[PDB]
Amino acid sequence: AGVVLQLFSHPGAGKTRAIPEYVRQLMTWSNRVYVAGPTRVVAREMLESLQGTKWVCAMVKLARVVVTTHQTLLRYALTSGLLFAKDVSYVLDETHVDSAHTKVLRALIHQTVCKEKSKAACIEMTATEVRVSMDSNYPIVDRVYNEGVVQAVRKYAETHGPARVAVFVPGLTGKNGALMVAKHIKQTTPYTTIVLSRKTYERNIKLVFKQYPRGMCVVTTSISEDLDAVFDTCQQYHYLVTAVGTKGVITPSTQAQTCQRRGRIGRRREGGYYRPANYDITQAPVLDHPDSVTLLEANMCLRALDLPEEPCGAAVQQAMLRLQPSKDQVYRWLTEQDTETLTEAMAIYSAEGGRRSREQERAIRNRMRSYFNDARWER
């Protein structure tokens, strides 16, 4: 019926087996079904796992079942009716991702599916009434290093022979930076280090797929979020709202973050998971750090569209008062999708959604720095 139905699916489960059955059960009452997942690789995985299902079309930026990503579905539902329709059901995978677009998308699918006179449903599936699924296809062994991540990867390199291994590191730089640890692993273990960041994902990813015999060590930021073990810093590089703007800080990753970083190893093979002893899984934030700037941009959009908002910190509530985009400023952001920050979209799109002059664009961003200093306008 017109209902939203969560399904707690463990990370990398035999979802493939189950999603084609959900699409045909939704062809009961509705005429199209949209399938979306965070990154493109999941969208291709979903496309693969629907191979034998007749009228299936992809949307990677007539038909009856579209698969695409969270982002470019949002970009589409907003530009082409869709939400005014009553015969479109949705299936969303990895609803627990830390993107503002997933958040607003979830709200809009919820609105158009529980709508009055609706004849469509939604199926949400996540690895996170407070529950986090830590099951996998194969068993996973949880261990604890007390002495640092590099040295626990040395212990592993010698106690075990070469394996495929991966290290989840907060930032590209720092004393625990991807660059910094890869050099130290390079110079100790016989493993070859493949660094993966958004800054370098596209070039090195190719390198990741060869069979490395002396050993392979993926040192990765959260973009990566097939191998035999995972070493977790249990730390991330959020940007956070600080009441003068935003600042970049290292944080204990959220329960949902580590649940996905772990969920990389148990899918096709036994795997081991190494977290630091001094990490409070019980006590870290479940889904989002209380005042992360992703929770600001999501609520900013949700308020303009007069949708239900998300639990957030006090510094965000404060910031949602200094910064109040209009329905169309957040449409232009969500639909032309060439400004990473909603804050900067407010500089280039007027209150009515039209493009601003060059001198108007520059006046507004300087005025905005008087009260909100977004530190993402640099790096």
Contact by Cβ (8 Å): 122, 154: no
Closest among 250, 292, 253, 260 to 276, alpha carbons compared: 253
Q: To the nearest 10°, the Cα dihedral for 223, 137, 123, 64?
A: 80
Closest among 46, 42, 59 to 20, alpha carbons compared: 46
Residues with Cβ within 8 Å of residue 161, at least 6 apart in sequence? none
Q: How many CA atoms lie within 13 A of 96 on its CB side?
A: 26
Helices marked H in the chain — which ranges? 15-26, 40-48, 70-77, 100-113, 149-159, 178-186, 201-207, 255-262, 293-304, 314-322, 327-336, 342-348, 358-369
The tokens describing 8, both together, are: 């707690």
Instruction: Residue 203: count other Cβ atoms within 10 Å of its Cβ.
Output: 10
Single-letter residue type at 336: E
- Solved by what technique? X-ray
Q: Which residues pair with 35 in a beta bridge?
A: 67, 91
Structural domain spans, the chain: 1-128, 129-289, 290-379
* Radius of gyration over every alpha carbon of the chain, rounded to an integer in angstroms: 22
Interior/surface letters 207-221, b for 16+ CB within 10 angstroms, e for the rest: ebeeebeebbbbbbb
Closest among 258, 282, 286 to 134, alpha carbons compared: 258
First to last CA, the chain: 46
Question: What CA–CA distance (Å, rounded) separates 265 from 270?
Answer: 7
Q: At what angle do helices 293-304 and 314-322 cross, to 10 degrees?
A: 50
- Cα 360 to Cα 354, 355, 366: the distances in Å are 12, 10, 10
Closest among 377, 372, 324, 376 to 351, alpha carbons compared: 324
DSSP 87-132: SEEEEEE-TT-S-HHHHHHHHHHHHHHSSTT----EEEEE------
Closest among 313, 375, 379, 322 to 346, alpha carbons compared: 322
Contact by Cβ (8 Å): 169, 196: no
The tokens describing 334, both together, are: 């969500």
Q: What SS3 state is found at 178?
A: helix
Contact by Cβ (8 Å): 90, 109: yes
339 — alpha (psi -120 to 50), left (phi > 0) or beta? beta
Phi and psi torsions of 86, nearest 5°: -120, 5
Q: Using CB atoms within 10 Å of the CB of residue 147, give its burial: 0 to 12 exposed, 13 to 18 middle, 19+ buried.
A: exposed
Phi and psi torsions of 35, nearest 5°: -120, 130
Interior/surface letters 24-58, b for 16+ CB within 10 angstroms, e for the rest: eebeeebebbbbbbbbbebbebbbebbeeeeebee
